[PDB]
A paper describes a structure:
ATTR amyloidosis is caused by the deposition of transthyretin in the form of amyloid fibrils in virtually every organ of the body, including the heart. ATTR self-assemblage caused by mutations in the TTR gene leads to variant ATTR (ATTRv) amyloidosis. Using cryo-electron microscopy, we determined the structures of cardiac fibrils extracted from three ATTR amyloidosis patients carrying the ATTRv-I84S mutation, associated with a consistent clinical phenotype. The four structures determined in this study vary in the assembly of this gate, and we classify them as the closed gate, the open gate, the absent gate, and the broken gate folds.
The density map from the second 3D class obtained from the curvy fibrils from ATTRv-I84S patient 1 was determined at a resolution of 3.1 Å. The N- and C-terminal fragments have a residue composition of Pro 11 to Lys 35, and Thr 60 to Asn 124, respectively. These fibrils have a crossover distance of 608 Å, a twist of −1.41°, and rise of 4.8 Å. In contrast to the closed gate fold, the gate in this second 3D class assembles in an extended conformation. Based on the position of Ile 84 at a hydrophobic interface with Leu 58 and neighbor residues, we anticipate that the mutation to serine could disrupt this interface and then favor the extension and twisting of the gate. We classified this new structure as the open gate fold. The structural alignment of the open and closed gate folds emphasizes the differences between the two distinct conformations, with the residues preceding Gly 67 being the most variable. By tracing the fibril segments contributing to these two map densities back to their respective micrographs, we observe that the two polymorphs can coexist within the same fibril. In the open gate fold of ATTRv-I84S fibrils from patient 1, the gate is extended.
Numbering used by the authors:
A (entry chain C), B (entry chain E), C (entry chain A), D (entry chain B): 10 to 36, 59 to 124
The structure:
């Protein structure tokens, strides 16, 4: 039972490529698989995550306040987008 | 029982490509598979996530306040969009 | 049962490529696999994460205040986007 | 059961490539695998992380205040994006 994978075998020219090839062959127990390829996070927020095993167990008093306030400019040209013969310009006068 | 996969075998020219090829062959127990390819998160918020095993068990007093307030500009041209012969410009006068 | 993987075998020219090839072959117990390739985080925030084993157990008093306020400019051209014959310019007059 | 991987076998020309090839072959117990390749973090913040085993156990009083305020410019051209025959310029007049 052979397995064969061909991706972009013969490439002639000047391309602009993003390639992600994931080949997986397999064969109280737990197994976890977390694969992440080409992940972009520009403005990402996580406040409470994975607090753990029994936090704040007894009479916890938590006062959490969060403010997202301010001039923030995120100017991106060609995010995760390859180009071959083009003109990518960010002109901020 | 052979398995054969061909993606973009012969490429002549100047393309702009995003390629994601995932080949999977298989054969108290738990198995978890989490694959993420080409994930873009510009403004993503998660406040309470995966707090864990028995948090805030006994007489918890939590005061959570969240405010999203402010001038934020997210100017993106060609997000996850390859281009071959084009003109991608972000002109902010 | 042979396994064969070919990616970008014969490349003639001047391409601009990102290649990520992950080949996986396998065969109280726990196994965890975390693979991350080409991960970009421009403005990423994590306030409370993995606090551990039983933190803040007894009569915790936590006052957390967070403010994101200020002029911040993130000007990016060609993020995770290779280019072959192009003109990437960031002109900030 | 042979395993064979070919990536960019014959390259003729002047490309600009990022290559990441991860080949994995395998065969109270715990195993953890954390692989990270091509990770970029421009402005990344982690305030509370991995606090440990039972911190702040008894009558903790924590006052945490955080302010992100100030003129910060992050001008990047060609982030994680190789180019072959191009003109990458950051002109800040």
């Amino acid at each position: 039972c052979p397995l064969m994978v061909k991706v972009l075998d013969a490439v002639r020219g000047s391309p602009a490529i993003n390639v992600a090839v994931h080949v997986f062959r397999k064969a109280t127990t737990e197994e976890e698989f977390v694969e992440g390829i080409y992940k972009v996070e520009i403005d990402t927020k996580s406040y409470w995550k994975a607090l753990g095993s029994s936090p704040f167990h007894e009479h916890a008093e938590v006062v959490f306040t969060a403010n997202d306030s301010g001039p923030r400019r995120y100017t991106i040209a060609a995010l995760l987008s390859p180009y071959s013969y083009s003109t990518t310009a960010v002109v901020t006068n």
